Amino acid sequence: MNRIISINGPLVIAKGKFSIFEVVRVGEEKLIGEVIGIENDKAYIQVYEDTNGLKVGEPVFNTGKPLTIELGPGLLANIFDGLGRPLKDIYEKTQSIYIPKGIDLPTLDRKKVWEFIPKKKKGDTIKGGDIIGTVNENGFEHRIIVPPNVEGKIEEIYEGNFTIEETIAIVNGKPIKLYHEWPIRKPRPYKEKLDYNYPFITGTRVLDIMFPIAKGGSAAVPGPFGSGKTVLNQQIAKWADSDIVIYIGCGERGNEMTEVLEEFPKLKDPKTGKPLMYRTILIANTSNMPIAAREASIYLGATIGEYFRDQGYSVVVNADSTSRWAEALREISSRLGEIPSEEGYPAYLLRKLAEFYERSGRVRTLNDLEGSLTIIGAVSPPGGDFSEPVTQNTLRLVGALWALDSKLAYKRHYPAINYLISYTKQWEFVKKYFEELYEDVIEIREEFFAILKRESELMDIVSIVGALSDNEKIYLHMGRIIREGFLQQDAFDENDSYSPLEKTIELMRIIHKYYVTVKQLLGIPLEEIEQKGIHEKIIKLRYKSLKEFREEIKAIEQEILSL
Amino acid sequence: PSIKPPLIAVELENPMLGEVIDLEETKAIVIAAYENKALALLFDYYTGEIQINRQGNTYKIAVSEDYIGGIFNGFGEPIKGPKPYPEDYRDINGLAINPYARKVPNEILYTGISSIDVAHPLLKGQKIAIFSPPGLPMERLALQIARNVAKDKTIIFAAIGVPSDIYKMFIDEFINTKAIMNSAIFISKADSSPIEKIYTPRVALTLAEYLAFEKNRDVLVLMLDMTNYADALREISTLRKEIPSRRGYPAYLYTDLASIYERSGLTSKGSITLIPMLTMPGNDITHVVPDLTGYITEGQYVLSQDLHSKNIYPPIDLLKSLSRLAKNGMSKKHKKYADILIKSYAKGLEARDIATIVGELSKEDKAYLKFAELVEKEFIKQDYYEYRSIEKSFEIIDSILSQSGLP
Amino acid sequence: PSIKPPLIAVELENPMLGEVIDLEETKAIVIAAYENKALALLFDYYTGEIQINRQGNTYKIAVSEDYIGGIFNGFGEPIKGPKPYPEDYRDINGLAINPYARKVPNEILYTGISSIDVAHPLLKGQKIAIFSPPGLPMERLALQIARNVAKDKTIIFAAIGVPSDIYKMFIDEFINTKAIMNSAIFISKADSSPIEKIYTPRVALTLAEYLAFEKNRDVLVLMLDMTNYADALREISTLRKEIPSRRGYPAYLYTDLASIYERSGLTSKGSITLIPMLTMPGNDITHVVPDLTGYITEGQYVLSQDLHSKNIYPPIDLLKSLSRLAKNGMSKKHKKYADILIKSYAKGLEARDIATIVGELSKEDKAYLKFAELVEKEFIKQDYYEYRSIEKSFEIIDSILSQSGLP
């Protein structure tokens, strides 16, 4: 009955009867689509697959359901596409290296056998979001939370080994599974937003001390191509203090998803000793995969993030890159013949971005536990111009700017964080933590910022001889030490890749200790101080084991003999 | 009919511009009308079909003192719970104030902040904006001002599309300072319909005009962020098939912003003191939003990335900032101090510029150089919880002048 | 009906998007379809009336090893003479590779070029672009690379709208180096239909995927010029009444470029190494074409007008250039040399900048200054017919370090 009357890129127009946001199946090959607009008897459909070869003489099928994701055991340590289709299973079914158009598989493995341990008894009353039991998912305690809409008395509840489609309990005559479906465009409910409490520790020094955010916060990472967004996000995905990590590859390179698949199983969590992959979920919609599925991948990853948050866990979502999602919005808007706003983007760009970032936050869950969803969004401004709409809109939504800089990347200073332009609006919520466990880090942080700023002021004068007084040269000296010994961090060195707080704090302390000594000694020249070569030893510290780092610090502390 | 949220296209006999229409689970505002064709903007998420009940009027709110102590959305509907008394209903657009009926502001509201009080004081009934680069503590500045100038006044806070972290920062401070019971808060979320966003400052100012000019009160209105407001206006302007201007913003942006900012001022009966806050997109004051706002408000407090990087709070640029009506409220002594501060700081900054050349030039120019350094360190720099009397601010200036070698 | 070459407007019962239609003396591709209206792009010059035969399918080519040793147009049709075996027909758009099925490139392909091999080595299966200002020897660089990394591999050359001088330069070098028999060449002329231009890289990569992933070969693909490709895409986008983006280029330019560049890589069975070449219009790397390409390829070799003016071939900017996957293939020794070269050259360039001031500054900074001079003269500068082993490149660095006074 329903028929296509037009095909324009990812946009299909069909005559028939439809509902807004209904998932439809387009053409004889039944491509997944979603109704985004209705005008009388016509429906405007964005198709999540390639539309080349589609015909005006073709049917469109109703489903009567919105776009959903299966939430349960089977997500962890696996890679999915923008629609939640498992790429490993696609490979195995097709026996091909290519992604076919129109393939439909269930998200969660239907044959894997799980062990369910109940936490409720028969006759217990249950409400939405309650933990009905737990499943061990390769070392992770997956909490089976009942859907927000289920409530009543447990008439039956089982225990033991089950697959995903099997009934594990019965409430008010309704079967409960190990999984439930949820519309990705719909934010998952909670009880109340909580105050920030605790810093988000990344394992990257510049992000942990200089511009930290709180757990449940959000940050933007804009930069030109080659500035280091992807590596920075992967570093966070590797070492972040978090229960669950969700990496969304939104419109980026296929090899970068493959890289994670290759490396994460070899790496060990510094907090559990378990391999990183077991806490990681990968969502991949590469640059050449269907453009509309980029939007799906963003809402999908957020929804899964909320799901683990609802279990009372801390979650981080890395989105690389949000600009590709913006391109998808612009393309859909263009086909719809909507009037473009600034830079060709639709006028509702800010509102759409907000639908993503407003999902972040620390909350009291429906089951009265505390959970957090932290969101890191990479941005890819054209030509590295930060004044563009995606970057600027994002800055009015997030809690920090982690700005990447061409000039630093140029000279291989990584992370290429611009320490003058970057900011965090959440230092007031995390300074408590650092004060308690490390008294002098607040002063030293201010000191680092003061030196980097002063060095910056001096480099313009330097373009008139490099003639400066010793009281000025000391800022270039200390600035170099902070940049090369603290801010810089090699993601691909076995010792420097991860920086625990102990190492981070100790580095700050030895730099500060060197600083107070050098200042006292101004009134012997700086030329004679630098000759001792203590600065070069400090700079090399970050490359050392840990039980070589501590030894070298002891060695440096004595060598700071101003006697 | 047509649906693409938040927009619906609908057939109506004799459509009224601005007309409120009831649907099953929601309302809409008619934003366009030709013959029997209408375009409407949904109040919120809607998916049902579009059976229509026409109210036969534009959007109005019941005005009373019931709002005081409460939290509401952009439409003036209660979030916390209890509805205010229906009715005494008022057009939320209101009317232009007759300039014959106005009184020019002439009474300084002391903030306790030196960088404001001396050279750029806020006057009762004045409208003055805060311009900020992204990331700078504009919110802390507004709260510190509100804490000191509204001890006796009703505070109305309009949150326009800001994230929860931001509006909760305000709410929590109002609660901790016990100002919450004498405040009315209107919030439109960042992902809300654009119609709710642009109505937010209108319902807040409709209440403000009622409280100030009917109940004879002095009122303080804070609103943030005007850049989000302009974005919502552009969204609506683009849904209407309007011919876009600079950066997609509607041609009437100045006039629309004015229809908000000019709903402030002083009369014989009461006053509305208005502080609109905005983020300057690329830290560019020439961007259309801060530029048009500059042409309307009676001055602005401009925050500085440079001062922020020097760990100076509040990071106020003394020279880019301006209070147009300031002179109306200043004594001859106050005028003298403001002039000496502004002129000497400016000369100090010029001397600073060439100091990245001659290094360290004239004796006279070494005195101004030091003055500017001390102004930033001892005068501008001030704690978030610190209140300085105007006399204390003068004393600091006197002390700095001596340290510098200037008279 | 309508004709304005290369565009025809035509009436079809149930049009198929991308459908190939036969005319008397030529073919066309349906690029738009609403109800029974279609827009089509002619393959070539046509003037006759528009009786239509519908193939009922999108454009496909017969895949085989028959292309090897031959020269073809953008549609894959033979220029030299003999047609390849029909069929085994494949959609020229192909399919996205499953990232689960990929292997990350980790094997260095040595070019023999020091400015590439040390700091920015090319890996097998990598996609890496060459960005050039107009006039610079980008073609010589690509040929020198192809000469050394494809001695054992099939070379596929896609010429997209380049003048005859350019594509004949490639053909003649392949002939003189005896690489022509193990090469497949696809050429669309500068004045050809835009549909032939955008199909050129698609038919070339369809063959490449067949050879690499079905016949288990390592393949090298060279394509030039991507700026001409984007121009053809814009031409088609504008013929469709699409809403233009920056500089008239279509909004989906990134996605379309990616649909080409990402058809490369490494698997257990074989590899496609891809080198797209483009001219940066006003020598501006921030122009939309090099900028989007930069966001997609796994690095780029950037040519420098400054080095060219100093008579340096190849004029590679060591610092603007990048190989993203380089570290995957480098030994610890190789990593050490790359780091020392990049960091010291950069410091040398900074010292050079201030040398137009202090003239000739620090002893340490005089050593870096000399290092950068010698890097350009003895390391980067290299003959078009010269091959340097990686060991030889390391030796040069060692020698320069000594001459400079650095360790």
Ligand SMILES: Nc1ncnc2c1ncn2[C@@H]1O[C@H](COP(=O)(O)OP(=O)(O)O)[C@@H](O)[C@H]1O
């Ligand atoms: N912390 C780091 N340590 C070492 N190398 C880095 C680091 N960050 C970035 N890089 C290097 O910089 C290059 C670009 O990084 P990438 O994340 O791909 O940039 P983007 O995603 O911004 O285009 C890569 O080759 C990578 O090896």
Ligand SMILES: [Mg+2]
């Ligand atoms: Mg496996």
Ligand SMILES: [Mg+2]
């Ligand atoms: Mg990247």
Ligand SMILES: [Mg+2]
């Ligand atoms: Mg978290």
Ligand SMILES: [Mg+2]
């Ligand atoms: Mg009434």
Ligand SMILES: [Mg+2]
């Ligand atoms: Mg009225």
Ligand SMILES: [Mg+2]
């Ligand atoms: Mg066949």
Ligand SMILES: [Mg+2]
């Ligand atoms: Mg095929």
